[PDB]
PDB file of C-alpha atoms in Angstrom:
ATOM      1  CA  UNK A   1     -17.143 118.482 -37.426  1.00  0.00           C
ATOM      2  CA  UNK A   2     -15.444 118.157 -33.780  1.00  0.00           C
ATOM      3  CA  UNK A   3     -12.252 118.660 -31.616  1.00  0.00           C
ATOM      4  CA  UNK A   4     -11.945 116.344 -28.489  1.00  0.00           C
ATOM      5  CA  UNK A   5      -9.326 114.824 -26.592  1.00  0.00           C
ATOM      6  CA  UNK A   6     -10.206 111.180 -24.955  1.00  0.00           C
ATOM      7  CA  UNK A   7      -7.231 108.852 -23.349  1.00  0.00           C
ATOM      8  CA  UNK A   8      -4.891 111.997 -24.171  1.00  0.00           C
ATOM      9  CA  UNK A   9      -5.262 111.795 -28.295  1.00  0.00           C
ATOM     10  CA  UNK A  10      -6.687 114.681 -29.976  1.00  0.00           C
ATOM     11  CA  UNK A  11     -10.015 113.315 -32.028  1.00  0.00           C
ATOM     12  CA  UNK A  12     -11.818 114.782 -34.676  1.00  0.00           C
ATOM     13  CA  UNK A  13     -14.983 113.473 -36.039  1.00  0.00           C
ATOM     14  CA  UNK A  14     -15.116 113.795 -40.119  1.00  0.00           C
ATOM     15  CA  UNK A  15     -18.074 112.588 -41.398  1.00  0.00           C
ATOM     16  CA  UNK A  16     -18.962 108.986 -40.139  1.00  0.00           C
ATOM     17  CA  UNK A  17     -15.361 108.557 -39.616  1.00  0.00           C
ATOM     18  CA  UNK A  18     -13.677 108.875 -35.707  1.00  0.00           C
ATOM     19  CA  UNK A  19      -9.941 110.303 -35.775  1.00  0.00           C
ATOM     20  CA  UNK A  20      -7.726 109.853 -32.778  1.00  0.00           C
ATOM     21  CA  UNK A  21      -4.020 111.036 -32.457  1.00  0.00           C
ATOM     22  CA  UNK A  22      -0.702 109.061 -30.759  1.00  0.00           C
ATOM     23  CA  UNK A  23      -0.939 108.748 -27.016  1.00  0.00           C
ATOM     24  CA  UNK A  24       1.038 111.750 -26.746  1.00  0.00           C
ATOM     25  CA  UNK A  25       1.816 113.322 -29.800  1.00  0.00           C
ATOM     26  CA  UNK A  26      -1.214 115.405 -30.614  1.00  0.00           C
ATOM     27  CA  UNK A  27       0.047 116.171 -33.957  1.00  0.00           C
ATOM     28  CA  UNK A  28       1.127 113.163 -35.601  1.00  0.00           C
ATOM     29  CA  UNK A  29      -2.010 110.875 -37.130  1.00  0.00           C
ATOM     30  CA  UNK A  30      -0.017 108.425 -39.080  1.00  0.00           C
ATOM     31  CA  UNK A  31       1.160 105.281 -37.394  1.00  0.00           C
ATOM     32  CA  UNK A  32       4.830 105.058 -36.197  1.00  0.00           C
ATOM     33  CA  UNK A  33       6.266 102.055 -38.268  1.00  0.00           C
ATOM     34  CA  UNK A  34       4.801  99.291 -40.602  1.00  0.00           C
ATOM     35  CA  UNK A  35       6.713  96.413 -39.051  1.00  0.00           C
ATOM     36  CA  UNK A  36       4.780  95.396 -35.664  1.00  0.00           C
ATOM     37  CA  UNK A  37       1.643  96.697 -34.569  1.00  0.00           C
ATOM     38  CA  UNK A  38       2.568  99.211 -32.301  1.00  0.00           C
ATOM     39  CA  UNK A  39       0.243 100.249 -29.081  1.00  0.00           C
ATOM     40  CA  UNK A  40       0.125 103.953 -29.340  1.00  0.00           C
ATOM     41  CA  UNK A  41      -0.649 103.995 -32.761  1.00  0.00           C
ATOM     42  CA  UNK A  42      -3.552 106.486 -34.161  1.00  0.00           C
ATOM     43  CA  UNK A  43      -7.257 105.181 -34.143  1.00  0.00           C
ATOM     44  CA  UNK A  44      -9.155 105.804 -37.773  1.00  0.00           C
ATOM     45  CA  UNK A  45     -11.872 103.230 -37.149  1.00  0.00           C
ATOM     46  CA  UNK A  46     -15.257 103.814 -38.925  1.00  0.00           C
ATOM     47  CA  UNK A  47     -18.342 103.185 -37.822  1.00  0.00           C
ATOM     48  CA  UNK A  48     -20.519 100.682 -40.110  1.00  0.00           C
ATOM     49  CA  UNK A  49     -23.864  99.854 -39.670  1.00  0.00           C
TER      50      UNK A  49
ATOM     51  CA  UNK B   1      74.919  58.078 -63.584  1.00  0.00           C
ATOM     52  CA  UNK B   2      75.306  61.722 -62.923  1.00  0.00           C
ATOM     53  CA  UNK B   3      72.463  62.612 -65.112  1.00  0.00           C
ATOM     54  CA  UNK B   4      70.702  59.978 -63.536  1.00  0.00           C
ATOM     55  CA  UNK B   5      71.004  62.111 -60.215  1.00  0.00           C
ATOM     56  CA  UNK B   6      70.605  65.278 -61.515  1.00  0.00           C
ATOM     57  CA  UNK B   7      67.035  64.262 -63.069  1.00  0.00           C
ATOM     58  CA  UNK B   8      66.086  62.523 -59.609  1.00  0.00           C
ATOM     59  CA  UNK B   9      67.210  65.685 -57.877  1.00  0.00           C
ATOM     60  CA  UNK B  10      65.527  68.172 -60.252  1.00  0.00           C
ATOM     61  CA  UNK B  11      62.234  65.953 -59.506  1.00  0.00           C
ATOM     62  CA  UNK B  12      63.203  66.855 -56.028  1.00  0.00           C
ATOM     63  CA  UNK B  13      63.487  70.549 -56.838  1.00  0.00           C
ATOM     64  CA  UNK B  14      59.552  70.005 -58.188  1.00  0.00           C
ATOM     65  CA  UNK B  15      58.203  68.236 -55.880  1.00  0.00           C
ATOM     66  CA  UNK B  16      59.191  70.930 -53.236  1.00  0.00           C
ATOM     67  CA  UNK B  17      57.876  73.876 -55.537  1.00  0.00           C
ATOM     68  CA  UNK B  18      54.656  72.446 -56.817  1.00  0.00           C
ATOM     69  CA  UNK B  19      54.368  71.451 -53.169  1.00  0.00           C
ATOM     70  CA  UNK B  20      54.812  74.853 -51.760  1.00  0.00           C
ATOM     71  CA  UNK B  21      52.412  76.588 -54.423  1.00  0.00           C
ATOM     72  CA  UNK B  22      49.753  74.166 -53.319  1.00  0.00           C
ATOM     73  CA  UNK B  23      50.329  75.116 -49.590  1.00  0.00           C
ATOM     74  CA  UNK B  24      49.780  78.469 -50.642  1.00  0.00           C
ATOM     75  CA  UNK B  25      46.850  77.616 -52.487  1.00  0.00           C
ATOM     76  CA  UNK B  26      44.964  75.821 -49.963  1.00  0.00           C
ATOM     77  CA  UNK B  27      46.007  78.070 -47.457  1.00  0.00           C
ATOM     78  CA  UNK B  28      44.962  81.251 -49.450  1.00  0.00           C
ATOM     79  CA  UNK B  29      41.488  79.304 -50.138  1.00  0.00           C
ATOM     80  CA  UNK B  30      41.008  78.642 -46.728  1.00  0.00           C
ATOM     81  CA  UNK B  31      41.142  81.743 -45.662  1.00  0.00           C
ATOM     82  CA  UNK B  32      38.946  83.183 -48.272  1.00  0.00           C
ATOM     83  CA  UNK B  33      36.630  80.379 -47.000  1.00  0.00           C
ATOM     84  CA  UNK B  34      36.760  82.208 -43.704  1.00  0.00           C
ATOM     85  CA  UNK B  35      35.967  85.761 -44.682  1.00  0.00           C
ATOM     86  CA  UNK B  36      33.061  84.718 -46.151  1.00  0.00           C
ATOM     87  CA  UNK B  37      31.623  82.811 -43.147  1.00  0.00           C
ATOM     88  CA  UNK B  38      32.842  86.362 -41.348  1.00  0.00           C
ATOM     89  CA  UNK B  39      30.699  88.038 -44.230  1.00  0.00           C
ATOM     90  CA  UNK B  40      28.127  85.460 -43.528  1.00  0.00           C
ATOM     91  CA  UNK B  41      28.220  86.155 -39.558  1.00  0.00           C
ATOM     92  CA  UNK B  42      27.701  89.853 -39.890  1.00  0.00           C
ATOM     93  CA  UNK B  43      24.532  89.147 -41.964  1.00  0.00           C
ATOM     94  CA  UNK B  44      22.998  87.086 -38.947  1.00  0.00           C
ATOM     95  CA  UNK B  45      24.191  89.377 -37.056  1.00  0.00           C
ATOM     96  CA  UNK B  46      22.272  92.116 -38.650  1.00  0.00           C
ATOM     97  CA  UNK B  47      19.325  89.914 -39.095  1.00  0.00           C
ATOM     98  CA  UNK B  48      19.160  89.422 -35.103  1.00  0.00           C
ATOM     99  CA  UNK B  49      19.732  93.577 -34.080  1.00  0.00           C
ATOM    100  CA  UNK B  50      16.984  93.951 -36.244  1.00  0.00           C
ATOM    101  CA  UNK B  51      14.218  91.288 -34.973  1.00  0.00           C
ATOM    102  CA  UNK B  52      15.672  92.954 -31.595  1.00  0.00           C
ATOM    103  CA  UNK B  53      14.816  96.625 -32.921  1.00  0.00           C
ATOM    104  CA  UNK B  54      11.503  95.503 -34.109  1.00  0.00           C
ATOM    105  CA  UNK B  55      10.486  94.331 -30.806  1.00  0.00           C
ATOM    106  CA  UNK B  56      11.850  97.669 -29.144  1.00  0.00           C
ATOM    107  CA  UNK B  57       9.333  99.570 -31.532  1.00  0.00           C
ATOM    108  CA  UNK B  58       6.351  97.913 -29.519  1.00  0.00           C
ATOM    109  CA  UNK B  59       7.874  97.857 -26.460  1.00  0.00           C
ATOM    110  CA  UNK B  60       8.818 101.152 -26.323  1.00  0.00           C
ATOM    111  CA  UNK B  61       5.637 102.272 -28.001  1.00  0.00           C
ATOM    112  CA  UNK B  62       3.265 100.641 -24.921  1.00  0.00           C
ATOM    113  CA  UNK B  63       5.378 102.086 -22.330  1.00  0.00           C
ATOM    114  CA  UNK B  64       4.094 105.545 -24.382  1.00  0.00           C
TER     115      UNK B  64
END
């Protein structure tokens, strides 16, 4: 539905669901590694209420 | 007793080689003993570099 770019990751906003890119890398949504919980990793929280 | 001698001597001649063989043999096992724990060292080894990669990926990630 949107394009915005908070904390220097490019969002989108898909139904009730927020998107947020790496820190940098605009173009990469999927996580870097599964083997520690990295700190630039991409935000796909959902909103539930 | 000259055969008497001879079969004491030729004892002799046994003990030495059966002697020998088993200094190779422990010698060779040994050894093979410490390859492995070589083998063994490298594994730990790798084990560590990668608990130290691991922690790289989330260091390196929050200085991004």
């Amino acid at each position: 539905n949107d394009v915005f770019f908070f904390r220097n990751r490019l969002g989108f906003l898909s139904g009730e669901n927020i998107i947020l890119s790496r820190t940098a890398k605009y173009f990469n949504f999927y996580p870097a590694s599964i083997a520690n919980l990295s700190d630039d990793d991409p935000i796909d929280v959902a909103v539930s209420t | 007793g000259q055969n008497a001698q001879a079969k004491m001597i030729a004892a002799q001649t046994a003990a030495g080689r059966r002697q020998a063989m088993e200094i190779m043999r422990q010698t060779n096992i040994q050894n093979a003993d410490l390859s492995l724990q070589a083998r063994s060292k490298l594994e730990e080894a790798s084990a560590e570099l990668t608990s130290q990669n691991m922690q790289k990926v989330q260091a390196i990630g929050s200085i991004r």
